[PDB]
């Protein structure tokens, strides 16, 4: 599989009283900010809070990523995780409320248990009898069975361009259909046809199965707002056809409390409330903010995790003011605020061992120094982007794994930001024919 | 285009063997959990719930349910077949003893029950 | 279910002796502000007495003072019979439409049309159709307790063959306007069939007499009849938005015709509450709308809430108090609310442990007390479920001194992260992007 | 009815026009076409077909 | 061809030893640069074994030092096999879009889905149909269809009656069909029947019969990227909109469920996913909302490796008045490695001008090739390749079988280079539009 930035981080690492491993389950150190991610996962898995919100804060690299994706992995698959960055607000299609509100939406899930009831066999009776409900008989290799059809899953089928001979597929339950193909019993009907034959199906003709369906109050909202999929054809047409998003109403958001509420009531329905994750919460404007405030009041809201970097910086949108983590004061009040702190050599030692062995890397201990003192001198994530170069040079060079020759030649052929500065600084001195564009 | 894709449910919305999604949604989001289905409807019909304007729109509990799932073409056809009922009221129901009559099921059809172009 | 605990849960009205407008120290969740409460509640008297139009109110106050819950106790105890639209200014910025535009939705959001209609509607299950086709016919229809055959006239056998009516379908005809429409089909025919369409429902028989009828009271806002009017279906934009700046001849014509509806007591026009929350973001433009809407027949009572001190309006270069222009306060009447006392924090806290289910020690109420003194009620507040989480973890009954401070430590307050990001000032990005990831 | 190669009894995707023979692939083909002038109709006599 | 003579015609490759990287000092259309092209050859190998996901270089260095050269290098060292998106960053500013959709589409182009489907098809040179119409038409029918080493009749269904009559066919063409649709195509018209082609002119083409089986198992390896499949999903055609461009703001529930089917499809063996790469040009004109978003977009499992060239110093970063390191913030840049190209040597000058002119069709004389030289290190690069053109039309239009000094001495003379045309308006200053909008127009 691929490795992506944090595919070594599986989890907050975390004993069963909560307390951070020293180095566990991918992390080191840390532990202050995983613990406080601990209480953050506790507070989502018990489903009674609405809107709590959470700060992360603290330097470029100093892992703020990385526990906001542990929390989404120690919270599992089932709980919806929904990230953006806080530049993602800008829509040209919608104002920016709709926007937030639509992302605070995908946070909330609801979990539908379906028995699904499927056939699927080759075609061998099509016959009516009502005045319009037919019978329909299916064929596998394993016997027939018999359908009465419900006059309008009888018109589904029809709209299909199912005959007798055909093989289809049959939702009973939900009602869709499918025409696989024709039968290859009937591929010598003529010797040429437009037609695309299939083998009989091998299994039995009837198939039962268990699925477990989730779905979010977003896609209550779009379903609801406007005709979807095979319903909107005229939506080809493109221009004013599209399906653009629109300024949902509260109205509608207020009809689909109410009839999600009455599903759950018959206990169809299973509510899941999730996480909205905003990193670069620094680009989110003062505009944002203030309806933040409105939408974290709700009494349905996910729990929202922020991340920023920023210092004392301007508030977006509001040049006259200014505030740590460009986060307005007014807003901050609202937050849980975890700090993640800078990383030590020896921590560096571990991450960079952590990410070699995670991207398949072998290296001699000497290479390990050696890039572990790019990371004090320069930075961390230095570190990291020089092990996959380093092991390509590495293996043309003939070597089985990693050396200070392979890292030394990937630090002359990557250069960081720093030294590249220097590079600009010497450089662009002039207007003349080969400075750099200031 | 590869049939997986465009065949064989790498298209989200079309049902069929390996895309169990689809079939499901369909149902429950416009049906099951559809605000605009009759029997959501009639929940919501009365005192100052989500449909109580319904009674005065001039439309069925059906006919809305249509209107919220046929697309604009479709419901231009719909459109077709209808009658101008209330722009022929304006020239009868005319003399102060009509009292500007209009259907209580049509009363917030305002803008078209009075405006110069059918008088025209 | 849906409804999960949020900051107001607990706000279950203002919290006044009503026939005196006093307010209790303590009641309906609300703790404290007794003379922002009473003014409050003078405004409430004036809403439900409706005779005064487009009075302005502003709730100043520093942050976590009460403003919101003092907003939210007035719509709980004004309650459903008067409109209560609760707007954030953000929201006014729309790409829809114009920022006096969206005002002007908000305005008539505000303002109830009360209708009393008696409905005359047959529901039941089919149990037979009967046609002649020499045009005449022949409905048999049932409750669980009735059961009637009813003389069809050619279009309703036109509208049921349209409609595909069929035994065991659960049908409603509306008298008034004769049209029919299939609910679904009953509980007792789902062993019709081995496969159902996906648009199949399935219901209980219809209950009681077949053709009841009913008082049915109706409250419609201006904006709903806006929409209604603005296109052939517009009430399909209630929903989706999508209303585009509606002409005004259309709201003219609106005005007029409710108002020959109170004249003729078809209606009664129930005027209510537009909140407009952190109105400081609203901006010049929209302020100079909202002095001519202020001065209207229509009007709702407008209220707002505001946080900030001197500070720049927005849409021009100058500051002022609250950040709104003097011209605008000129129409204001304003009300002020004031930091929380130690004993009003320790109410606070303990209504919100109560609503949160927290079982806090005395010694736990003490300390979280004095963190709200020290570092805000908010924080405070949301040490209360932290603690809950973390005595869990130990399995423990109460939230005690301990489950707290490790609270404490772990989250940090908001003065406490100021400090923090000034320690660390050369590692974090500054306004002018200086950062350094050394060590 | 599913179709068989006349020489080899293998799938027949082909029919030829000339022989009249059924033939799987262009080898078989490449045989049929160069058959003495009486052995065209055995095969087909094992199907019982006949032109004569 | 349609393919004209175009600034990089000459890149054919990198120019790099596959077993060890070892830049050569010229091939494949590249000269010099070999520190950076060495790199350069280090990440297409990251490329092309796909593991690493998101890393993002940086080609920093002057105007006119080869780093759109070495870009083109790689995307003809990878090939048509693998999705590489150029991107020019004024290209982000849609109307359409946000600025931050047209970055996901530009990231989701990079990815590719690579899926292999088989047909049957049957092709081969037509010698008889014949059709029953009773009258309403195609009752039944019968085609007489060959190889040079095969002949068969089909009886025909009715609706391939209706392809064959749609698509006209008749005795000589050349057809081929995919009968697992049915739809056939005209692959043209056989020599043979040419005197039956009455209604056909004389540009008319033809073919030689088709050749062995006529029925095959084709193969066909389809790569389809993530974005398409996005695009598809949004509306009920909306493969139309990767052509129009009218993709809205595509939801990211779309993209979501995708990425879900995706990776059932890779773990099921259905399909393969084939990470390319991104190319921005000009990334230093991206703002701070652009930066703040790929930040995090590169994190993704379906990250393509990104590539970026800016010729900026410390330059004010657009969308925010504060200075950076190639117009870059650093808060980027930590998550970036660079790769610094140099001024060329008056040889490597040479050489880059010679093939400039072999590319071109202009014989040179040794002269003329010195004093070109000598211009590119004085007016730089591009403006003595500029002259290459002008003194062959010179020379052509005396007549002249070389490019001699004279030829290249009236270009110089006729087009001023940058210096001497920043001299020019100095110079002139009273006669131009200064910034302060003042001008003479008096003699
Ligand atoms: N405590 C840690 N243990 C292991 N890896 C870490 C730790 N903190 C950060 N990383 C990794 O180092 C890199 C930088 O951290 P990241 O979370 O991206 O920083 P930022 O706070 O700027 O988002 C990422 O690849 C991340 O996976
Ligand atoms: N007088 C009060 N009684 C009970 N709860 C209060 C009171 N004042 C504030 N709170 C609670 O404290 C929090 C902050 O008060 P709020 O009114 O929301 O802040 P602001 O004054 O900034 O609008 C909310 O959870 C609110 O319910
Ligand atoms: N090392 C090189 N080898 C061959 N051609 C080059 C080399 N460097 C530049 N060129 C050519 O010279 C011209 C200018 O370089 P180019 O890469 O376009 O500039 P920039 O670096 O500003 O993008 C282009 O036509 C390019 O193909």
Redesign the interface.
């Given at each position: 599989h691929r490795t992506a930035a944090h595919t070594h981080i599986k989890g907050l690492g975390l004993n069963s009283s909560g307390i951070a491993e020293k180095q566990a389950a991918g992390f080191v150190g840390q532990c202050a900010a995983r613990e406080a991610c601990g209480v953050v996962v506790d507070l989502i898995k018990a489903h009674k809070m609405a809107g709590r919100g959470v700060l992360l804060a603290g330097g470029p690299g100093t892992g703020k990523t990385a526990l906001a994706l542990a929390i989404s992995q120690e919270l599992g698959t089932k709980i919806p995780f929904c990230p953006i960055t806080g530049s993602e607000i800008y829509s040209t299609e919608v104002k920016k409320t709709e926007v937030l509100m639509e992302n605070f939406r995908r946070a909330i899930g609801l979990r539908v248990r379906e028995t699904k009831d499927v056939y699927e066999g080759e075609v061998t009776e099509m016959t009516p009898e009502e005045a319009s409900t037919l019978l329909i008989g299916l064929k596998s290799a394993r016997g027939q069975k018999k359908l009465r059809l419900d006059p309008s899953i009888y018109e589904a089928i029809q709209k299909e361009r199912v005959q007798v001979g055909d093989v289809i597929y049959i939702e009973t339950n939900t009602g869709a259909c499918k025409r696989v193909g024709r039968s290859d019993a009937y591929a010598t009907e003529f010797d040429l046809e437009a037609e695309e034959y299939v083998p009989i199906p091998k299994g039995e003709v009837h198939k039962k199965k268990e699925i477990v369906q989730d779905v979010t109050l977003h896609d209550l909202d779009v379903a609801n707002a406007r005709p979807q999929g095979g319903q909107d054809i005229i939506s080809m047409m493109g221009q004013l056809m599209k399906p653009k998003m629109t300024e949902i109403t509260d109205k509608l958001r207020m009809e689909i409390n109410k009839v999600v509420q009455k599903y759950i009531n018959q206990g169809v329905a299973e509510l899941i409330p999730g996480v909205l994750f905003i990193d670069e919460a620094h680009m989110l404007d003062i505009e944002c903010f203030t309806y933040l405030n409105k939408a974290l009041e709700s009494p349905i809201a996910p729990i929202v995790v922020l991340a920023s970097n920023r210092g004392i910086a301007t508030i977006r949108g509001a040049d006259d003011l200014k505030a740590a983590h460009g986060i307005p004061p007014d807003f901050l009040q609202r937050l849980l605020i975890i700090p993640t702190h800078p990383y030590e050599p020896d921590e560096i030692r571990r991450i960079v061992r952590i990410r070699a062995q995670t991207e398949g890397v072998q290296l001699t201990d000497a290479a390990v120094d050696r890039v572990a003192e790019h990371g004090v001198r320069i930075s961390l994530r230095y570190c990291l982007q020089l092990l996959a170069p380093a092991s390509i040079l590495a293996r043309v060079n003939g070597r089985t794994q990693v050396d200070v020759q392979d890292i030394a030649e990937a630090e002359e052929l990557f250069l960081d930001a720093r030294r590249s500065a220097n590079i600009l600084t010497s450089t662009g001195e002039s207007g003349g024919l080969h400075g750099f564009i200031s | 285009?590869?049939?997986?894709?465009?065949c064989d449910?790498?298209?989200?919305?079309?049902?069929?063997?390996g895309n169990?999604?689809?079939?499901?949604?369909?149902?429950?989001?416009?049906?099951?959990?559809?605000?605009?289905?009759?029997?959501?409807i009639?929940?919501?019909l009365?005192?100052?719930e989500?449909f109580?304007?319904?009674?005065?729109?001039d439309?069925?509990?059906?006919?809305?349910?249509r209107?919220?799932?046929?697309?604009?073409?479709?419901?231009a056809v719909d459109?077709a077949s209808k009658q101008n009922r209330l722009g022929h009221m304006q020239i009868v129901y005319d003399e102060p003893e009509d009292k500007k009559w209009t259907?209580?099921?049509a009363?917030?059809?305002?803008?078209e029950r009075?405006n110069p172009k059918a008088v025209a | 279910g849906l409804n999960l605990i949020a900051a107001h849960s607990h706000i279950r009205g203002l919290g006044v002796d009503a026939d005196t407008l006093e307010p209790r120290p303590s009641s309906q969740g609300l703790v404290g502000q007794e003379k922002a409460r009473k003014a409050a509640a003078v405004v409430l008297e004036m809403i439900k007495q409706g005779k005064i139009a487009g009075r302005a109110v502003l709730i100043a106050g520093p942050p976590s003072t009460g403003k919101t819950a003092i907003a939210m106790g007035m719509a709980q105890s004004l309650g459903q019979d008067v409109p209560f639209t609760t707007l954030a200014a953000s929201e006014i910025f729309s790409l829809e439409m114009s920022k006096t535009e969206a005002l002007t939705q908000a305005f008539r959001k505000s303002i109830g049309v009360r209708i009393k209609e008696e409905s005359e509607i047959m529901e039941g299950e089919v149990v037979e159709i009967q046609i002649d086709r020499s045009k005449q016919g022949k409905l048999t229809i049932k409750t669980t307790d009735m059961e009637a055959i009813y003389d069809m006239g050619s279009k309703m056998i036109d509208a049921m063959t349209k409609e595909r009516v069929m035994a065991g379908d659960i049908i409603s005809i509306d008298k008034s306007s004769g049209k029919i429409t299939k609910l679904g089909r009953s509980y007792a025919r789902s062993r019709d069939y081995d496969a159902m369409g996906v648009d199949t429902k399935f219901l209980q028989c219809p209950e009681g007499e077949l053709q009841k009828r009913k008082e049915v009271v109706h409250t419609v806002s201006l904006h709903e009849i806006d929409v209604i009017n603005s296109r052939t279906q517009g009430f399909l934009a209630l929903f989706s938005g999508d209303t585009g700046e509606i002409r005004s001849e259309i709201r003219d014509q609106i005005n007029t015709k409710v108002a020959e509806w109170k004249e003729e007591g078809k209606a009664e026009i129930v005027p209510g509450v537009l909140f407009i929350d952190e109105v400081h973001m609203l901006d010049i433009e929209c302020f100079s709308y909202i002095n001519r809407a202020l001065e209207s027949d229509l009007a709702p009572i407008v209220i707002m809430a505001s946080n900030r001190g001197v500070s720049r309006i927005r849409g021009t270069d100058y500051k002022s108090p609250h950040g709104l222009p003097l011209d605008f306060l000129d129409r204001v009447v304003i009300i002020n609310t004031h930091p929380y006392t130690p004993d009003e924090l320790r109410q606070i806290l303990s209504i919100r442990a109560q609503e949160e289910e927290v079982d806090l020690t005395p010694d736990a109420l003490a300390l979280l007390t004095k963190i709200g003194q020290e570092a805000g009620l908010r924080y405070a507040s949301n040490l209360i479920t932290t603690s809950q989480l973390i005595a869990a973890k130990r399995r423990a009954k109460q939230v005690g001194v301990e489950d707290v401070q490790r609270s404490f430590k772990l989250f940090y307050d908001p003065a406490r992260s100021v400090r923090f990001v000034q320690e660390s000032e050369k590692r974090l990005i500054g306004n002018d992007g200086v950062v350094d990831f050394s060590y | 009815m599913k179709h068989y190669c006349d020489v080899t009894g293998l799938p027949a995707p082909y029919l030829d026009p000339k022989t009249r023979l059924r033939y799987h692939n262009k080898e078989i083909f490449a045989m049929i076409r160069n058959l003495p002038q009486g052995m065209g109709e055995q095969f087909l006599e094992a199907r019982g077909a006949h032109t004569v």
């Open positions: - | 285009l590869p049939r997986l894709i465009w449910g790498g298209r989200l919305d079309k049902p069929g063997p169990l999604v689809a079939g499901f949604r369909s149902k429950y989001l416009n049906h099951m959990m559809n605000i605009w289905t009759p029997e959501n009639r929940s919501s009365e005192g100052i989500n109580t304007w319904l009674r005065f729109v439309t069925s509990l059906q006919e809305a349910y209107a919220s799932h046929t697309d604009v073409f479709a419901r459109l259907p209580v099921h009363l917030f059809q305002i803008c009075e | - | -």
